[PDB]
From Swiss-Prot:
MF GO annotations: carbohydrate binding; cytokine activity
Record carries keyword Disulfide bond: yes
Subcellular location: Secreted; Cytoplasmic vesicle
GO cellular component: cytoplasmic vesicle; extracellular region; Golgi apparatus
Function: May be involved in retinal laminar formation. Promotes epithelial to mesenchymal transition.
Domain GG-type lectin: 12-164
Name assigned to this protein: Protein FAM3C
Length: 164
């Protein structure tokens, strides 16, 4: 029940629970081993892609950062992705828009962490991913005919167990 997940995790596994943001008003949330890594109440989330780096052995946070994929520059995001070392658990959640400023290099870099949905990520699609230098990847496409919100899809949620 760590992170409030439905099924308990076995040995040498980290429990995790994550959600994308809701439209441009509720920030994403990332929890691991009952520790909230990123959230709105923590005030360490923002528009774009929100990324948490976790030590693959201890399960403790290394770093948390967010990059504006609507109004920001992709270059600091690309630099930050190139710093991720082997063994590090990387958790990514979208907030509002995570795709407009993405480049083929940025998408290739995320794909190398184990992502299949990043290549096709589009304007305002919601997406959560837990990988490392897959699986655990979930997305909801931005679709005007189906969207819960006026211009944005519903929050996408994911939970599971990462091997140590």
């Amino acid at each position: 029940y760590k992170c409030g997940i439905s099924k308990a995790c076995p040995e040498k596994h980290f429990a995790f629970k994550m959600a994308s943001g809701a439209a441009n008003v509720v920030g994403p949330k990332i929890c691991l081993e009952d520790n909230v890594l990123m959230s709105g109440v923590k005030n360490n989330v923002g528009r774009g892609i929100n990324i948490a780096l976790v030590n693959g052995k201890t399960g403790e946070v290394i770093d948390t950062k967010f990059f504006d994929m609507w109004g920001g520059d992709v270059a600091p995001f690309i630099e930050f992705l190139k710093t991720i070392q082997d063994g590090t658990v990387v958790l990514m959640a979208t907030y509002d828009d995570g795709a407009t400023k993405l480049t083929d290099e940025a998408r290739r870099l995320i794909a190398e962490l184990g992502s299949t949905s990043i290549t096709s990520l589009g304007f305002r699609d919601n997406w959560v991913f837990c990988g490392g230098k897959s699986p655990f990847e979930q997305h909801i496409k931005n679709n005007k005919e189906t969207n819960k919100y006026e211009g944005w899809p519903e929050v996408v949620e994911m939970e599971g167990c990462i091997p140590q």
